[PDB]
Scaffold this active site. Sequence first.
Site, PDB file in Angstrom:
ATOM      1  N   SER A   1       0.824  -1.245   0.000  1.00 51.00           N
ATOM      2  CA  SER A   1       0.000   0.000   0.000  1.00 51.00           C
ATOM      3  C   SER A   1       0.844   1.276   0.000  1.00 51.00           C
ATOM      4  O   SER A   1       0.280   2.331  -0.390  1.00 51.00           O
ATOM      5  CB  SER A   1      -0.997   0.103   1.122  1.00 51.00           C
ATOM      6  OG  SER A   1      -0.327   0.289   2.350  1.00 51.00           O
TER       7      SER A   1
ATOM      8  N   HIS B   1      -5.319  -4.934  -0.803  1.00 52.09           N
ATOM      9  CA  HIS B   1      -5.341  -3.807  -1.753  1.00 52.09           C
ATOM     10  C   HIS B   1      -5.526  -4.330  -3.173  1.00 52.09           C
ATOM     11  O   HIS B   1      -5.643  -3.455  -4.068  1.00 52.09           O
ATOM     12  CB  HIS B   1      -4.070  -2.953  -1.603  1.00 52.09           C
ATOM     13  CG  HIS B   1      -4.134  -2.132  -0.365  1.00 52.09           C
ATOM     14  ND1 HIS B   1      -4.836  -0.927  -0.292  1.00 52.09           N
ATOM     15  CD2 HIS B   1      -3.660  -2.364   0.868  1.00 52.09           C
ATOM     16  CE1 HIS B   1      -4.758  -0.464   0.959  1.00 52.09           C
ATOM     17  NE2 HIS B   1      -4.039  -1.311   1.661  1.00 52.09           N
TER      18      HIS B   1
ATOM     19  N   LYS C   1     -12.014  -2.391   2.214  1.00 52.47           N
ATOM     20  CA  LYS C   1     -11.429  -1.553   1.121  1.00 52.47           C
ATOM     21  C   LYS C   1     -12.412  -1.604  -0.053  1.00 52.47           C
ATOM     22  O   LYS C   1     -13.501  -1.004   0.065  1.00 52.47           O
ATOM     23  CB  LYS C   1      -9.995  -2.009   0.910  1.00 52.47           C
ATOM     24  CG  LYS C   1      -9.111  -1.894   2.137  1.00 52.47           C
ATOM     25  CD  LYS C   1      -7.752  -2.442   2.035  1.00 52.47           C
ATOM     26  CE  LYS C   1      -6.978  -2.510   3.341  1.00 52.47           C
ATOM     27  NZ  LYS C   1      -7.658  -3.486   4.220  1.00 52.47           N
TER      28      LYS C   1
HETATM   29  C1  S5R Z   1      -2.017  -5.056   3.331  1.00 53.66           C
HETATM   30  C2  S5R Z   1      -2.988  -5.002   4.455  1.00 53.66           C
HETATM   31  N1  S5R Z   1      -3.314  -6.129   5.136  1.00 53.66           N
HETATM   32  C3  S5R Z   1      -4.176  -6.120   6.170  1.00 53.66           C
HETATM   33  C4  S5R Z   1      -4.828  -4.965   6.628  1.00 53.66           C
HETATM   34  C5  S5R Z   1      -5.739  -5.038   7.823  1.00 53.66           C
HETATM   35  O1  S5R Z   1      -7.112  -4.925   7.331  1.00 53.66           O
HETATM   36  P1  S5R Z   1      -8.259  -4.224   8.173  1.00 53.66           P
HETATM   37  O2  S5R Z   1      -7.953  -2.743   8.101  1.00 53.66           O
HETATM   38  O3  S5R Z   1      -8.205  -4.702   9.582  1.00 53.66           O
HETATM   39  O4  S5R Z   1      -9.526  -4.532   7.443  1.00 53.66           O
HETATM   40  C6  S5R Z   1      -4.461  -3.673   6.000  1.00 53.66           C
HETATM   41  C7  S5R Z   1      -5.115  -2.422   6.523  1.00 53.66           C
HETATM   42  N2  S5R Z   1      -4.589  -1.278   5.830  1.00 53.66           N
HETATM   43  C8  S5R Z   1      -5.007   0.078   6.269  1.00 53.66           C
HETATM   44  C9  S5R Z   1      -6.154   0.088   7.266  1.00 53.66           C
HETATM   45  C10 S5R Z   1      -5.350   0.828   4.979  1.00 53.66           C
HETATM   46  O5  S5R Z   1      -4.242   0.483   4.112  1.00 53.66           O
HETATM   47  C11 S5R Z   1      -3.786   0.742   6.864  1.00 53.66           C
HETATM   48  O6  S5R Z   1      -3.802   1.973   7.102  1.00 53.66           O
HETATM   49  O7  S5R Z   1      -2.747   0.065   7.063  1.00 53.66           O
HETATM   50  C12 S5R Z   1      -3.565  -3.712   4.869  1.00 53.66           C
HETATM   51  O8  S5R Z   1      -3.196  -2.610   4.211  1.00 53.66           O
END
Ligand code: S5R
Lengths: 394, 394
Positions: free
Chosen positions: A184, A212, A243
Amino acid sequence: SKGKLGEKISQFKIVEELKAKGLYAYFRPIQSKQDTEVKIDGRRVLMFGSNSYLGLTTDTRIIKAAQDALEKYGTGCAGSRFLNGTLDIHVELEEKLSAYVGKEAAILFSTGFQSNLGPLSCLMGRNDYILLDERDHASIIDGSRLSFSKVIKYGHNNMEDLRAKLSRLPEDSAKLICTDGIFSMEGDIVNLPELTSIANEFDAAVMVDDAHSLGVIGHKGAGTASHFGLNDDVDLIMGTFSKSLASLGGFVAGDADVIDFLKHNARSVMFSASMTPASVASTLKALEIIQNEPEHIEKLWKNTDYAKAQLLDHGFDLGATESPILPIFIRSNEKTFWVTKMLQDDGVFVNPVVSPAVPAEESLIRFSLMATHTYDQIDEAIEKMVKVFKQAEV
Amino acid sequence: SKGKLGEKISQFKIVEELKAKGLYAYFRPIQSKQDTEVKIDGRRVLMFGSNSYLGLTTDTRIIKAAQDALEKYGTGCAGSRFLNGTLDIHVELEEKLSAYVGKEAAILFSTGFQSNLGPLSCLMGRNDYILLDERDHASIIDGSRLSFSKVIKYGHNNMEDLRAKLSRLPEDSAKLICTDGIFSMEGDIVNLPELTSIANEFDAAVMVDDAHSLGVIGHKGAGTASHFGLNDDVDLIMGTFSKSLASLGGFVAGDADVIDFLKHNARSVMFSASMTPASVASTLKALEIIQNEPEHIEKLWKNTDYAKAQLLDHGFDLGATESPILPIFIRSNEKTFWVTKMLQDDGVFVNPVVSPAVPAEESLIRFSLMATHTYDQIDEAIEKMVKVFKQAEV
Ligand SMILES: Cc1ncc(COP(=O)(O)O)c(CN[C@](C)(CO)C(=O)O)c1O
Ligand SMILES: Cc1ncc(COP(=O)(O)O)c(CN[C@](C)(CO)C(=O)O)c1O
């Protein structure tokens, strides 16, 4: 008692300093639905900091599915899936997700974060190994920490480093490689062909976190394995509902025997309450819409291609994105905070990336597209980003 | 690749054996709202395995609050509270919870599980210590594992063992004691007076996990500190929304400076999507109802007192519960599975506790009360539990 506790937190001054300078832009309180424009302090603000890639949190059909599930099932299941928290609609969603990513079986978790903690905590044990891309999501680092295995990081998308590190390990041990599909921060895609070639040579398990990627890459949005045609070479597909799928929760999909082991051994599914009925139904309806209405993924990519080309035309320094995440380099923590708050006060929401998460010289803002953005909204944001980068002298 | 992975899970045969014997009763698929009676396979089943202690997941007012929040705010915030995921209603709920438990400030998490991971992972560091009751919830064990501190377990409610273990530690280190308030297995309450006396003597931080205490013990349900009058001696009150509060999510409440540190340093709030609008509104309305309508907590306790007295009259061997959790000893894993499935097929839902979670000789069923249960439902369940314990020969 607070003596030593007061000491532990006494050195953390960056928030106090951002607030005093009038630069603080975390926890911004939105007063409206997540959408291309949000209300903050009664003012309208363009949202280019979201993960709602297909703009579906405002879809009346998805809202209606969620409201109908509250009417039938109430506000909460009040226990773990393991005991009194499983609904017929949880199992329906698992079957629907399994079909989508082309796997035998799936187990839901109440968050994406918890969906990584489950498999990483309980599959590899004493004398086993977990191999992590150094840029893996915090949830993957933390899941691996919860295992009783030896966690090794390899250089970001560095297949020589992964090969070398695996080569050093005893033959007589289990290995699991875990990688983000789309990463991300810079919006880049894992080298899944070479990673899976290496995995096959060392008989290592492969897990991909498609947070993502779902609803973004792959056939009808089905993710990173689908993008490369490597369904067969990936053991576990993890995803999240927060997302593209406009909800809350996540899943891990895989062979029936692996998923059966996880759903009875993963502490984050045994010891945490199940997804709300409203979130199961919203995820179900969103998944139906992504598959049946190809226009959402199409418009996301038209917006991504348009915005990237406009940004490069204006001479912004972009990271090596292959996704709707457009990382715009600033290369100063102070300028990154200032640019973020000036854009906020001019009605543009972007997300900063600063030290200690990255080196100061690699500080940036992330500008994320949604399918529901208009070319006019993109033009207005980029106009304002030109003006603020000028005022900031980048 | 699956060779070694197939090996890691090859020894896990207990589910295959329960299913083949016709004894399996995990992940039972409920077809209706969580209530005193649920539908499973089109049949009506009495629910004595829930954590909805005040029966509020079916309250039309709470359902309506959740449906109205979907209409205004959509299906999901699509990012962390830290970035684009904070709503005015998140902040309203934090203020309301802070007032309820008598603390300066609160930060929400998207699950209870994640509410323990936050503070335990990020407050104590290298050369610091976390002291855990050996019967602490799995989320507390896992949170402490995610810290960079030395985790020490002390004997269950054993204040001499806690005192001794703390006495051995360098003066020049931070300590944090973390305990369940009500412990869910046997339903017993922490010795908070002696634990807080010890904490004060060693200047150790105190955190209490009130998952099972909120809406159960304390003035108007405000939890374990409120129950003992020890608000002043507890640094952090953690709770969850998935039990009395009929929703999903949790919080940590504490001094403004501690909470500000947590909300910017806890990976489980920085790197996970925020609570759905529907769950914020359901929690808000449930909290209002618990405080304004004292009859719910009253009827829960009338049902608890009635059922405990009826169970002891029939000569069941109960654990040392001080809560609406009535642990009924069976003392054989095989008999525990058989009793659980026979009660299921006779229309009574209870939760088994077996090896390896406990020694075989301490295997039991948990019979949990809700405010909405009737004395007639209790009588019917206990009738059926007498019949099955007879058929099983306990
Ligand atoms: C690659 C990956 N794996 C798992 C998750 C966890 O998912 P969840 O948020 O609990 O539904 C995120 C959350 N990512 C967010 C919330 C947006 O990118 C962040 O700021 O890191 C993520 O970017
Ligand atoms: C003491 C404590 N602390 C934290 C939690 C986590 O809360 P969450 O479920 O994520 O809202 C639980 C969950 N306890 C349940 C789910 C029911 O007791 C269990 O089976 O263990 C719990 O019992």
